[PDB]
Amino acid sequence: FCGKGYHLMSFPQSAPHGVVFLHVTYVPAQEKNFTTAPAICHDGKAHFPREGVFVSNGTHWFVTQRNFYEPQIITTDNTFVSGNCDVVIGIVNNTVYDPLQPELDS
Amino acid sequence: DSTECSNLLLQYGSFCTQLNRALTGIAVEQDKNTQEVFAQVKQIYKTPPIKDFGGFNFSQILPDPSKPSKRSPIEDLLFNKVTNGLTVLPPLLTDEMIAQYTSALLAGTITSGWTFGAGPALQIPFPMQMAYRFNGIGVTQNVLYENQKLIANQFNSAIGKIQDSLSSTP
Amino acid sequence: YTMSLGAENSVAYSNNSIAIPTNFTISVTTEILPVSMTKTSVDCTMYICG
Ligand SMILES: *[C@@H]1O[C@H](CO)[C@@H](O[C@@H]2O[C@H](CO)[C@@H](O)[C@H](O)[C@H]2NC(C)=O)[C@H](O)[C@H]1NC(C)=O
Ligand SMILES: *[C@@H]1O[C@H](CO)[C@@H](O[C@@H]2O[C@H](CO)[C@@H](O)[C@H](O)[C@H]2NC(C)=O)[C@H](O)[C@H]1NC(C)=O
Ligand SMILES: *[C@@H]1O[C@H](CO)[C@@H](O[C@@H]2O[C@H](CO)[C@@H](O)[C@H](O)[C@H]2NC(C)=O)[C@H](O)[C@H]1NC(C)=O
Ligand SMILES: *[C@@H]1O[C@H](CO)[C@@H](O[C@@H]2O[C@H](CO)[C@@H](O)[C@H](O)[C@H]2NC(C)=O)[C@H](O)[C@H]1NC(C)=O
Ligand SMILES: *[C@@H]1O[C@H](CO)[C@@H](O[C@@H]2O[C@H](CO)[C@@H](O)[C@H](O)[C@H]2NC(C)=O)[C@H](O)[C@H]1NC(C)=O
Ligand SMILES: *[C@@H]1O[C@H](CO)[C@@H](O)[C@H](O)[C@H]1NC(C)=O
């Protein structure tokens, strides 16, 4: 409706008998392949991303936002637990870091 | 072919030119309408040869290789169910190319989600695309993943009911 | 010639691979929309009879 791509903002310009809209939009570019999974199996529990998607570069698993590649460590703060690992089709095994663990470790 | 009639008709001026120009405008407007509706992608996408979409069946909407017209069963049913100075101009886009455009749109929305509409087509598995759509309407991803078989069965049943309803209603 | 609808692009779909963008382009596009016409008035008596 407001240009090709993900619309950010627009500018109006007067024209003789008309209006010209300058649509400023965000277009994704330089995409890269990653290996993906619906959920992460850890401690017999299934972890799902709160807002992002699980990606793998070949050896390590990360969670990133869907529209830009920004890999982050899979923790309990960006994932939520629902059910065990027996129901979700295609769940893979990976560790889930806990931020609270070094605090009581030290 | 009456020359006397044309000689008398010339007294009325450029009425014929106005009528021809109006009809020409309507005729180009129809092609513009078809261009706006169907030609919304500049890449012709195709589905993978293996139709592994996590249990989701799209046979009724994807093009049939067996048919010479390369139409879907639903599209074939739709085409079957529709039955002095005058000329009919052919449409600029044939039915085959419109079917090809719909095939490209279907392949893009199945294999790439909504990414192809906003830029380059980024591949995503279909049970992840469905989870994203579930998140769009405010339902968590886990609900989709846990009940993926039931949702796939319901979707296939609904598509079959759509084909039956179209085939059974005049 | 017979027209080509678009350049061919086969998306590499598989059940466990995703494509993630690593960059972006800020694209500005133009949309021209007519708003009004010339306001014309015709004196019917003057036009037909003068
Ligand atoms: C996937 O990304 C991770 C994170 O960068 C890579 O792990 C790093 O690999 C480099 C290369 O030897 C090491 O120097 C770093 O110390 C590693 N970081 C961690 C946290 O282990 C990993 O190698 C990448 N895998 C592939 C296949 O590219
Ligand atoms: C992911 O981890 C689970 C649990 O550790 C694995 O499930 C085990 O699989 C072995 C061999 O198939 C069985 O003998 C165990 O009884 C299973 N345990 C449970 C709790 O199910 C699973 O195979 C792992 N997946 C991968 C790909 O390594
Ligand atoms: C997807 O749906 C199609 C259409 O319903 C299935 O094709 C049917 O398969 C059964 C079993 O072989 C046949 O008895 C029907 O006659 C087929 N219907 C048609 C219209 O061909 C197909 O099996 C489903 N699954 C897959 C994986 O394609
Ligand atoms: C992700 O991987 C797929 C598969 O390796 C890539 O698809 C191939 O791209 C090359 C380059 O033009 C083609 O020649 C092959 O025919 C493609 N294969 C298939 C099965 O379509 C894809 O390009 C990769 N994505 C990125 C961003 O590099
Ligand atoms: C993302 O794309 C932008 C293009 O806008 C890249 O910026 C260019 O980077 C090259 C190499 O450093 C420069 O020679 C160009 O002059 C830059 N262009 C502009 C407009 O600044 C940017 O580097 C890309 N980033 C990544 C991570 O790929
Ligand atoms: C993808 O399909 C292959 C078989 O072609 C299967 O082994 C694998 O488990 C599937 N992965 C997912 C996530 O469904």
Side-chain angles (χ1 to χ4, degrees):
Chain A
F1 190 67
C2 310
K4 176 56 72 180
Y6 297 117
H7 171 238
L8 292 176
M9 65 185 293
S10 296
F11 295 121
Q13 295 287 272
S14 62
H17 299 302
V19 61
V20 173
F21 289 105
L22 302 194
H23 297 301
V24 188
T25 58
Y26 175 101
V27 173
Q30 298 183 249
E31 66 272 5
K32 170 164 192 54
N33 280 337
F34 296 97
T35 301
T36 191
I40 294 298
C41 183
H42 179 64
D43 296 331
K45 294 183 291 293
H47 302 254
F48 305 88
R50 292 183 188 271
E51 63 184 3
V53 51
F54 293 134
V55 286
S56 168
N57 60 342
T59 54
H60 285 145
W61 281 97
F62 305 99
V63 59
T64 182
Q65 54 186 284
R66 308 163 178 171
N67 303 299
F68 185 78
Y69 182 50
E70 184 180 87
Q72 286 181 355
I73 304 296
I74 296 169
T75 66
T76 57
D77 297 356
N78 45 29
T79 55
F80 68 95
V81 170
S82 179
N84 46 7
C85 305
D86 292 332
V87 180
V88 179
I89 301 152
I91 187 165
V92 302
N93 290 350
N94 197 82
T95 190
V96 168
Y97 176 79
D98 205 303
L100 194 146
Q101 183 66 41
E103 312 312 305
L104 82 156
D105 188 4
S106 305
Chain B
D1 54 324
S2 164
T3 185
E4 297 91 3
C5 186
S6 49
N7 287 344
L8 291 179
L9 184 54
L10 284 178
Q11 310 297 139
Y12 289 107
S14 63
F15 277 139
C16 284
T17 307
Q18 293 298 109
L19 300 164
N20 294 355
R21 182 181 295 130
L23 289 182
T24 303
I26 293 175
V28 304
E29 189 158 66
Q30 302 322 294
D31 290 328
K32 185 191 194 327
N33 284 346
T34 311
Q35 179 79 29
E36 292 294 328
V37 167
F38 291 104
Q40 294 210 5
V41 283
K42 296 290 95 178
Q43 310 281 304
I44 305 300
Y45 301 114
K46 291 187 300 290
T47 57
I50 304 302
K51 304 291 185 292
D52 183 22
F53 300 115
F56 288 86
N57 194 316
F58 304 109
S59 62
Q60 303 319 106
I61 61 176
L62 282 180
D64 204 334
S66 74
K67 304 298 185 191
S69 63
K70 300 296 185 292
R71 270 192 299 267
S72 84
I74 285 169
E75 281 175 328
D76 207 291
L77 197 145
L78 291 168
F79 271 75
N80 287 130
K81 283 210 75 65
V82 169
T83 58
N84 288 335
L86 294 176
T87 42
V88 167
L89 302 173
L92 179 57
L93 286 172
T94 65
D95 297 327
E96 292 86 1
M97 283 183 290
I98 297 167
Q100 187 149 220
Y101 268 134
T102 59
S103 78
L105 292 161
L106 282 154
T109 191
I110 281 162
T111 62
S112 75
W114 57 78
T115 67
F116 79 108
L122 319 171
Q123 74 264 13
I124 172 170
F126 193 80
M128 297 203 63
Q129 175 180 357
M130 193 50 76
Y132 280 24
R133 297 180 182 275
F134 262 54
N135 280 181
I137 58 154
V139 183
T140 58
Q141 281 187 336
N142 69 272
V143 175
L144 187 272
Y145 292 134
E146 289 157 359
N147 306 322
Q148 176 186 334
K149 182 66 182 295
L150 168 66
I151 294 169
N153 287 343
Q154 282 181 353
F155 171 74
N156 297 347
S157 298
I159 287 290
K161 281 175 241 153
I162 283 306
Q163 189 153 4
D164 293 351
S165 174
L166 286 173
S167 178
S168 66
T169 305
Chain C
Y1 49 89
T2 297
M3 66 182 80
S4 61
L5 295 178
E8 200 67 38
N9 198 337
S10 174
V11 170
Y13 177 83
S14 71
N15 65 344
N16 66 329
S17 180
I18 204 164
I20 306 294
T22 68
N23 208 335
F24 39 75
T25 299
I26 298 305
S27 170
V28 177
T29 59
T30 51
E31 176 161 25
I32 296 100
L33 282 175
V35 170
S36 55
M37 287 187 289
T38 293
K39 293 162 61 182
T40 72
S41 184
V42 176
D43 190 358
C44 174
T45 302
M46 174 155 171
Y47 172 73
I48 299 173
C49 293

